[PDB]
């Protein structure tokens, strides 16, 4: 009930699709177990669409769990919008033994509306120990801009904290800054994980990925040497990275060669794994692809030897 | 390298000898070279690329096709290096040039002048099909079969020799 | 041996020690005490004689 | 693989596990309400030695298993080991009854023991005159004895004290006396502030070593 | 948040430099040298701390020495056997 | 690339 | 016999060592199981690789609760060339960051508000209700923990929840509380303050 | 001015990290440099000025008392 609150929960609503109406409305707790009689959820999207945003017409909705309807939004549709991952690192001590979620989500919101004095960020502790924040940018100048906003899964104690990259604006070094201010860390590195499966960069991060007799084949010591060493660089459940992992060279031809090889997949570590089988690598598939969840890193920065 | 004649033939043992970078292709083929109940023992033979590594007991091997993946390079530039793998006496009759994914022609990274220029350059017959598809591969299999019996000495009638005046 | 002979003179210690630590009361006062079976390091006639069958016998089988 | 496995308890040192045998006493009988959770009472043996320290283990857990998740529990646990050295554990052997960290305490006492023994071996050892040194399993008592004042002498403890949550604490102690002849020849205050001073003497040099020093700079003043 | 930096900047100057003077301080107590090991211990001192008792157990003690000249040494010389 | 990027 | 009686220890592993390696080529499968007192209800599973150049390969010492993962990747930074004392002080992390996540799974009702805890229950700070005697103040205790080792807590901060000194009485139940809080875990001590605190004495201002 | 800001912060987010790690080893110098050689070269002089509580021996004597029959017993 309110200018770019209401609008943006009907902008927010109708992007989920039809299945998933109770699952996330029951998790931002505007509609209690009574409101949720009231609007019948089978007939159309357009009927929901609007007395769902009645339902908090009359709520009085504010911006704070406005966005908080898009980070149980996000949180089931965390495939789009590739994701960044930052690395914090503190310098040499003890660990940090207060990492309150009230002090985190204060240093957070202090420090970012210290310089992005006009922001909604709205924080959402999730189940996992993840805290999954949402940041509506927009300068001093401007509203908060709520169409386009950046949300940040800052895993709680984890030093690292993944980013959706949707603009990468002159705040991608202030939410760095905020975050490493907030959580208390001393340095942020983008690690260089861009991937838009959170569910997999989370995995990639803090590697919790793996924890007939008449047909006579004669290349058959061949065939299960390439299986052998596709089950030794690729053990078991490749993740699915789904993303450009770019690699720009700057090699010389065997003075240097410049090309930015983007390996585009739906799953990219298990078509990479299908890859020496199928004749399509050779049976020691080159560190260059395997070592990507190895590296927990894809788009890499090192150079020749 | 590979000879035609080095090795005895068996009883009513034909076994060729399917040549092809992609084996699921190879392995699709050689299942429906079998799936049909011929009066010959085929013990069909998979590879990659025709240097075959030296193993003895290997059969008097009857038949050679080159399946030529015409969607991918590799499949052909494998194929002549390992075509300077065969005798000259085995490019006489028991030597076809299967040509897999043609028809398609959108895929084609090989222009299917080139593969025709490569099995005449050779001469010996190209047979083309498309192994992606059953429908295509029972029928073309049992074209590598009967092509198998002649280079094999099983039609009584029909030497390898006698195939490629036949097939040119 | 002279381990042997120093078994011998812990035998005879075993008479000699025992008799001399029992007649000296005010040791009596260690080993009961809250404060010295807990911080001080935390009848053994026949206990010593088990120090010198059990010993000198096990010594010159080593 | 069961060489790999006595491979990985040299290695991973959880000591060696020699003596084991796994009995399971099933108590899932209909006196505990068997409408409600599940539950079941083994008991397994487990007796091993150290490098040096022997153990033998009466080990019976109850093995809550509710409806939904198993509770994972102990009942009856009796140690049988070494005399003294765990007479301070013998506080655990009824806290784990009142069980993993006995694997991690004694985990790490047999360590302490190996810094006690080869450092005592090594200090008598390398050099034993002004050294005298109680030779015991738990006896951390050296003699020192330096003749440039004709009546000195001094001992360093080396006390052993694990607490209740099974951290290992090196009690470092200079237990100081000096007989009778020479107690009042210094007539300084250097003998009065001996066992405050060693804590920091230990933090200079290793822990080994400030007791070497320690021998080379007041026994070994007849030495040197 | 400039002079929080420059407040910081004065203790990090006065610290290199300060820890440059102690640093030369430092060769100087190695020099001396020339010529939670203890955080978890730094209680127990107190126990060396913890008269009528003294005098006797010394008197027993010297007597206990003649005894300890058969029994600490039979105990030094059994623990070797078994160190040994 | 050879890992550069 | 022997397969039966030395691979039996595996077990035998299991439920006492809290290091049961798994004997996986290229790297033992270190299944560290971890108990509190004497009941055990997890266990960290962290992968490995037999290489001199020591590389953990994907752990799984709990990366929600990632201290421990931290110290997956910052205890090696202290000592790792010895597995022998890694094990230990992994199982000491994993051993005691089980222990303060057992000691919030306690939590039922006794307290009012949410238990916002921190991964490893680092900062327990739930503002609970224990009242003998009607006059309601709560105190909410943040319980703080200097050491990732110790199980009990270290700083323990049992606050009067923005009130001013009361009675003596409350005074008295805040230190007993900061002291049995310091030295009995809340699992032996949210038991027996109930125990105390009978029949369930909720609050009014809270 | 806000871009500014974020490279104070940074700047400042170093200046702490780097401020906190030189007090940690002002600590750690000042500790060990100042008290060592004063307790250390002071009594390891000390005991070479003594060289060249009572209860503590007593106590001595009953650990290598209990010693024999604990020997005994193994």
Same mark, same amino acid.
């Given at each position: 009930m309110d200018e770019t609150v209401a609008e943006f929960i009907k902008r927010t609503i109708l992007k989920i699709p039809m299945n998933e109406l109770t699952t996330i409305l029951k998790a931002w707790d505007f509609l209690s177990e009574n409101q949720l009689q009231t609007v019948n959820f089978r007939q159309r999207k357009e009927s929901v669409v609007q007395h769902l945003i009645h339902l908090c017409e009359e709520k009085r909705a504010s911006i704070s769990d406005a966005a908080l309807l898009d980070i149980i939004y996000m949180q089931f549709h965390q495939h789009q919008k590739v994701w960044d991952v930052f690395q914090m690192s503190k310098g040499p001590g003890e660990d940090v033994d207060l990492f309150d979620m009230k002090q985190f989500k204060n240093s957070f919101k202090k420090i970012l509306q210290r310089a992005l004095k006009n922001v909604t960020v709205s924080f959402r502790e999730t189940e996992e120990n993840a805290v999954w924040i949402r940041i509506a940018w927009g300068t001093q100048?401007?509203? @908060?801009?709520?169409?386009?906003?950046?949300?940040?899964?800052?895993?709680?104690?984890?030093?690292?904290?993944?980013?959706?990259?949707?603009?990468?604006?002159?705040?991608? @070094?202030?939410?760095?800054?905020?975050?490493?201010?907030?959580?208390?860390?001393?340095?942020?590195?983008?690690?260089?994980?861009?991937?838009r499966y959170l569910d997999s960069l989370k995995a990639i991060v803090f590697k919790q990925y793996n924890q007939d007799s008449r047909i006579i084949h004669e290349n058959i010591v061949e065939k299960e040497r390439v299986q052998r060493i596709t089950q030794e660089t690729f053990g078991?459940? @490749?993740?699915?990275?789904?993303?450009?992992?770019?690699?720009?060279?700057?090699?010389?031809?065997?003075? @240097?060669?410049?090309?930015l090889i983007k390996f585009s997949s739906p799953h990219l570590l298990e078509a990479l794994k299908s890859l020496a089988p199928a004749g399509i690598a050779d049976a020691p598939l080159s560190p260059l692809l395997t070592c990507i969840p190895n590296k927990r890193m894809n788009y890499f920065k090192i150079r020749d030897k | 390298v590979l000879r035609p004649l080095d090795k005895l033939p068996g009883l009513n043992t034909a076994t060729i000898l399917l040549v092809g970078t992609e084996d699921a292709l190879l392995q699709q083929l050689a299942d429906s070279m079998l799936k049909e109940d011929c009066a010959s023992e085929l013990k069909v033979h998979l590879a990659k690329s025709l240097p075959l590594p030296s193993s003895v007991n290997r059969p008097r091997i009857d038949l050679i096709v080159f399946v030529v993946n015409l969607h991918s390079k590799y499949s052909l530039q494998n194929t002549e290096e390992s075509l300077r793998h065969v005798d000259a006496s085995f490019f006489l009759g028991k030597v076809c040039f299967l040509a897999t994914g043609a028809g398609r022609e959108? #895929?084609?990274?090989?222009?299917? #002048?080139?593969?025709?220029?490569?099995?005449?350059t050779y001469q010996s017959p190209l047979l083309y099909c498309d192994l992606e598809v059953e429908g295509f591969r029972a029928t073309m299999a049992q074209r590598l079969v009967r092509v198998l019996q002649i280079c094999a000495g099983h039609v009584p009638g029909v030497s390898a020799l006698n195939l490629l005046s036949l097939l040119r | 041996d002279e381990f042997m002979m120093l078994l011998s003179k812990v035998e005879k210690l075993s008479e000699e020690i025992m008799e001399i630590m029992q007649n000296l009361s005010s040791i009596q006062a260690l080993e009961g005490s809250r404060e010295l079976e807990n911080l001080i390091g935390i009848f053994l006639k026949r206990e010593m004689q088990k120090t010198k069958e059990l010993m000198t016998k096990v010594n010159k089988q080593k | 693989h069961l060489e790999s496995e006595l491979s990985f308890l040299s290695t991973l040192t959880g000591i060696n596990i020699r003596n084991h045998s796994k009995q399971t006493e099933d108590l899932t009988s209909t006196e505990m309400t068997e409408k409600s959770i599940r539950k079941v009472l083994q008991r397994h043996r487990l007796s091993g030695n150290c490098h040096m320290v022997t153990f033998q283990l009466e080990f019976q857990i109850l093995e809550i298993q509710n409806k939904e998740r198993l509770s994972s529990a102990v009942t009856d646990l009796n140690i049988i080991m070494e005399p003294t050295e765990c007479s301070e554990l013998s506080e655990f052997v009824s806290r784990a009854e009142e069980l993993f960290m006995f694997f991690r305490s004694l985990h790490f006492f047999v360590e302490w023991f190996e810094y006690r023994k080869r450092t005592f071996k090594h200090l008598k050892e390398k050099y034993p005159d002004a050294v005298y040194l109680s030779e015991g399993p738990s006896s951390c008592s050296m003699g020192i004895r330096?003749?440039?004042?004709?009546?000195?002498?001094?001992?360093?403890?080396?006390?052993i004290q694990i607490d209740e949550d099974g951290k290992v604490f090196p009690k470092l102690d200079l237990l100081t006396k000096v007989p009778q002849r020479a107690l009042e020849l210094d007539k300084n205050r250097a003998i009065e502030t001996a066992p405050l001073s060693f804590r920091t003497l230990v933090g200079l040099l290793g822990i080994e070593a400030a007791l070497e020093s320690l021998i080379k700079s007041l026994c070994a003043e007849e030495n040197n | 948040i400039d002079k929080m930096v420059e407040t910081t900047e004065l203790m990090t100057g006065n610290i290199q430099s300060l820890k440059n003077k102690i640093q030369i301080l430092a060769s100087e107590v190695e020099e001396e040298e020339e010529r939670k090991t203890l955080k978890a211990p730094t209680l127990q001192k107190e126990i060396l701390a913890l008269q009528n008792a003294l005098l006797k157990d010394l008197d027993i003690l010297h007597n206990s020495s003649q005894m300890k000249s058969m029994s600490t040494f039979i105990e030094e010389a059994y623990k070797k056997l078994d160190a040994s | 690339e050879f890992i550069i990027d | 016999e022997e397969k039966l009686e030395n691979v039996k220890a595996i077990l035998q592993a299991y439920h006492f060592t809290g290091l049961s390696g798994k004997l996986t080529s290229r790297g033992?499968?270190?299944?560290?199981?971890?108990?509190?007192?004497?009941?055990?209800?997890?266990?960290?599973?962290?992968?490995?690789?037999?290489?001199? &150049?020591?590389?953990i390969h994907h752990h799984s010492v709990p990366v929600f609760i990632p201290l421990e993962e931290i110290a997956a990747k910052y205890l090696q930074t202290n000592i790792q060339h010895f597995l022998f004392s890694l094990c230990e002080y992994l199982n000491a992390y994993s051993g005691?960051?089980?222990?303060?996540?057992?000691?919030?799974?306690?939590?039922?009702?006794?307290?009012?508000? $949410?238990?916002?805890?921190? &991964?490893?229950?680092?900062?327990?700070?739930?503002?609970?209700?224990?009242? &003998?005697?009607?006059?309601?103040? &709560?105190?909410?205790?943040?319980?703080?923990?200097?050491?990732?080792?110790?199980?009990?807590?270290?700083?323990?901060?049992?606050?009067?929840?923005?009130?001013?000194?009361?009675?003596?009485?409350?005074?008295?139940?805040?230190?007993?509380?900061?002291?049995?809080?310091?030295?009995? $875990?809340?699992?032996?001590?949210?038991?027996?303050?109930?125990?105390?605190?009978?029949?369930?004495?909720?609050?009014?201002?809270? | 001015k806000k871009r500014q800001r974020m490279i104070e912060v940074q700047d400042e987010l170093l200046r702490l990290e780097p401020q906190l790690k030189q007090l940690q080893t002002k600590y750690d110098e000042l500790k060990e440099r100042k008290s060592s050689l004063r307790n250390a070269a002071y009594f390891l002089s000390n005991l070479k000025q003594l060289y060249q509580y009572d209860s503590s021996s007593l106590p001595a004597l009953l650990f290598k008392a209990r010693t024999l029959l604990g020997a005994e017993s193994h």
């Open positions: 100048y401007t509203k @908060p801009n709520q169409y386009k906003p950046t949300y940040v899964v800052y895993y709680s104690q984890t030093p690292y904290a993944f980013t959706s990259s949707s603009m990468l604006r002159r705040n991608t @070094p202030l939410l760095g800054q905020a975050l490493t201010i907030a959580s208390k860390h001393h340095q942020i590195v983008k690690m260089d994980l861009r991937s078991d459940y @490749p993740q699915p990275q789904l993303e450009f992992a770019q690699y720009k060279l700057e090699t010389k031809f065997k003075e @240097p060669l410049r090309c | 959108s #895929h084609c990274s090989i222009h299917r #002048h080139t593969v025709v220029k490569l099995a005449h | - | 330096s003749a440039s004042r004709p009546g000195f002498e001094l001992v360093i403890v080396w006390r | - | - | 033992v499968c270190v299944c560290i199981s971890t108990a509190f007192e004497g009941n055990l209800l997890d266990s960290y599973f962290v992968d490995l690789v037999i290489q001199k &150049p020591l590389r005691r960051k089980y222990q303060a996540d057992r000691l919030q799974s306690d939590f039922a009702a006794l307290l009012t508000g $949410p238990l916002q805890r921190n &991964p490893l229950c680092n900062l327990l700070s739930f503002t609970y209700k224990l009242d &003998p005697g009607g006059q309601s103040f &709560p105190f909410c205790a943040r319980l703080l923990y200097k050491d990732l080792t110790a199980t009990l807590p270290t700083d323990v901060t049992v606050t009067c929840q923005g009130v001013e000194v009361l009675s003596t009485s409350w005074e008295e139940q805040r230190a007993s509380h900061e002291t049995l809080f310091c030295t009995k $875990p809340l699992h032996q001590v949210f038991a027996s303050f109930t125990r105390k605190g009978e029949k369930l004495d909720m609050s009014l201002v809270s | -």
